[PDB]
Design an enzyme around this catalytic site. Structure first.
Site, short mmCIF file in Angstrom:
data_model
loop_
_atom_site.label_atom_id
_atom_site.label_comp_id
_atom_site.label_asym_id
_atom_site.label_seq_id
_atom_site.Cartn_x
_atom_site.Cartn_y
_atom_site.Cartn_z
N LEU A 43 34.82 35.32 112.08
CA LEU A 43 34.79 35.52 110.63
C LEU A 43 34.92 34.20 109.86
O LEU A 43 34.28 34.04 108.82
CB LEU A 43 35.86 36.53 110.18
CG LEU A 43 35.67 37.98 110.67
CD1 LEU A 43 36.88 38.83 110.32
CD2 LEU A 43 34.41 38.62 110.09
N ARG A 45 36.80 29.74 110.13
CA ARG A 45 37.63 28.69 110.71
C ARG A 45 38.25 27.87 109.57
O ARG A 45 37.57 27.51 108.62
CB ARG A 45 36.80 27.77 111.64
CG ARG A 45 37.61 26.62 112.24
CD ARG A 45 36.74 25.51 112.81
NE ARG A 45 36.44 25.74 114.22
CZ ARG A 45 35.56 25.04 114.93
NH1 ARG A 45 34.88 24.05 114.37
NH2 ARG A 45 35.34 25.34 116.21
N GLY A 46 39.54 27.60 109.71
CA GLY A 46 40.30 26.75 108.81
C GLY A 46 40.87 25.57 109.58
O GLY A 46 40.62 25.46 110.78
N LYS A 47 41.66 24.71 108.92
CA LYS A 47 42.27 23.56 109.59
C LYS A 47 43.43 23.99 110.50
O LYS A 47 43.83 23.22 111.38
CB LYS A 47 42.75 22.51 108.58
CG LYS A 47 42.58 21.07 109.07
CD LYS A 47 43.24 20.04 108.13
CE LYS A 47 42.36 19.59 106.98
NZ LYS A 47 41.27 18.69 107.43
N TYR A 48 43.96 25.23 110.32
CA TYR A 48 45.10 25.71 111.09
C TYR A 48 44.81 26.91 112.01
O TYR A 48 45.65 27.22 112.86
CB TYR A 48 46.28 26.02 110.15
CG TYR A 48 46.87 24.78 109.50
CD1 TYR A 48 47.78 23.98 110.19
CD2 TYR A 48 46.51 24.40 108.21
CE1 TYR A 48 48.33 22.84 109.61
CE2 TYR A 48 47.05 23.27 107.62
CZ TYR A 48 47.96 22.49 108.32
OH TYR A 48 48.50 21.36 107.75
N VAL A 51 39.55 32.87 112.80
CA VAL A 51 39.70 34.30 112.56
C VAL A 51 38.50 35.07 113.12
O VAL A 51 37.36 34.69 112.89
CB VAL A 51 39.98 34.55 111.05
CG1 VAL A 51 40.06 36.03 110.73
CG2 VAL A 51 41.26 33.83 110.58
N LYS A 66 43.73 36.43 114.65
CA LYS A 66 43.88 35.07 114.13
C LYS A 66 44.41 34.15 115.25
O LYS A 66 45.58 34.26 115.60
CB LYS A 66 44.79 35.08 112.89
CG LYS A 66 45.07 33.72 112.29
CD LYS A 66 45.98 33.92 111.09
CE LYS A 66 46.56 32.66 110.53
NZ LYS A 66 47.45 32.97 109.37
N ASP A 154 50.68 29.90 98.97
CA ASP A 154 49.22 29.71 99.11
C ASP A 154 48.47 30.85 98.44
O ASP A 154 47.48 31.36 98.97
CB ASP A 154 48.79 29.52 100.59
CG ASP A 154 47.43 28.86 100.78
OD1 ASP A 154 46.96 28.16 99.84
OD2 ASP A 154 46.84 29.01 101.86
#
Ligand SMILES: O=C(O)c1ccc(Nc2nc(-c3ccccc3)cs2)cc1
Length: 327
Positions: A43, A45-48, A51, A66, A154
């Site tokens: 779904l 991708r983030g820096k952490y 998903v 996640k 956030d």
């Protein structure tokens, strides 16, 4: 040095709780079976984290997996503790399982599935009634986590999953969430640029739950004025300049004077002098149907430099802006 500050609500919730509640480092993770879940598609991708949409092959139920990156794998115990403490709360994402990903070797969080509609397509297509309805649903989640001694840190459109067909909302990504302890100095490198509170931008570390209320105000301004994002900074410094062109420089200086904060001298060549703007300047033929005197009064009470002067989540739920919403 800076003058100390405390939250005006839920100040001592964690001081009374047994250590086990907030001492997340002492928590022991009960790991489930990763083979219970079959991954379908990535779904995002983030820096952490990464998903994935997945299927729980035992009951054929759709879930979201996640997988945390090693950089975020360090503070997994904090996110797990917070998610378990808030589980069952109004409009809070439900943590269904915790497993060990065989590839990354890092923890993977399993959540209930929400059929979200892109905010870049939704949030800017809602009616006046729907903006009020969904804002009230977000407030239920914020008052709940703040009442449990937790700051989200956030709040932004991408962190609010909405199933517009079923009128269901969930506040997600508790990766930056933290326990509020009176007098504690926190990391200012939290929230996304456009949603960062002035306390973060001026490097004031003794902040509280009120940070989430500034972020919520930024979301409301974007919805009712049809401007995405409302405060569009080029960087963290220009972010404070964009805010000061709307709220004015005199109230900013009063804020930093009150808390005895010394502004980064780089602001001397970019801040300038600005008077506070009336909200009618942002009203035009394309957004006038989303604006009312109640919406403007509510926005005025969230978008305040002084974190102590902002409405709390409970006070916000009492506002006339929500009188039209069915309860
Ligand atoms: O706590 C969390 O971080 C969490 C919980 C539930 C979550 N549900 C979902 N995410 C998505 C998604 C994620 C990234 C890009 C595009 C779509 C779709 S449905 C995602 C993340």
């Amino acid at each position: 040095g800076p003058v100390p500050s405390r939250a005006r609500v839920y100040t001592d919730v964690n001081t009374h709780r047994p250590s086990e509640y907030w001492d997340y480092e002492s928590h022991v993770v009960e790991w489930g079976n990763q083979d219970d879940y079959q991954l379908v598609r990535k779904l995002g991708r983030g820096k952490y984290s990464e998903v994935f949409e997945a299927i729980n092959i035992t009951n054929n139920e759709k879930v979201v997996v996640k997988i945390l990156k090693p950089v975020a794998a360090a503070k997994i115990k904090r996110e797990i503790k917070i998610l378990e403490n808030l589980r069952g709360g109004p409009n809070i994402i439900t943590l269904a399982d915790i497993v060990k990903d065989p590839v990354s070797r890092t923890p993977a969080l399993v959540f209930e599935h929400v059929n979200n509609t892109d905010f870049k397509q939704l949030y800017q297509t809602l009616t006046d009634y729907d903006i009020r309805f969904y804002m009230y649903e977000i407030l239920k989640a914020l008052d709940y986590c703040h009442s449990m001694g937790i700051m989200h840190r956030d709040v932004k459109p991408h962190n609010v999953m909405i199933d517009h067909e079923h009128r269901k909302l969930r506040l997600i990504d508790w990766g930056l969430a933290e326990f509020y302890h009176p007098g504690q100095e926190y990391n200012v490198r939290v929230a996304s640029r456009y949603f960062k509170g002035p306390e973060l931008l001026v490097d004031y570390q003794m902040y509280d739950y009120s940070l989430d209320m500034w972020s919520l105000g930024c979301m409301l301004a974007s919805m009712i004025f049809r401007k995405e994002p409302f405060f569009h900074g080029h960087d963290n410094y220009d972010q404070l300049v964009r805010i000061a062109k709307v709220l004015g420089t005199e109230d900013l200086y009063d804020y930093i004077d009150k808390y005895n904060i010394e502004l980064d001298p780089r602001f001397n060549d970019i801040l300038g002098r600005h008077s506070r703007k009336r909200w009618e300047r942002f009203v035009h033929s394309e957004n006038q149907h989303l604006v009312s005197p109640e919406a403007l009064d509510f926005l005025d009470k969230l978008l305040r430099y002084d974190h102590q002067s902002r409405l709390t989540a409970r006070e916000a739920m009492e506002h006339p802006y929500f009188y039209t919403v069915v309860k």
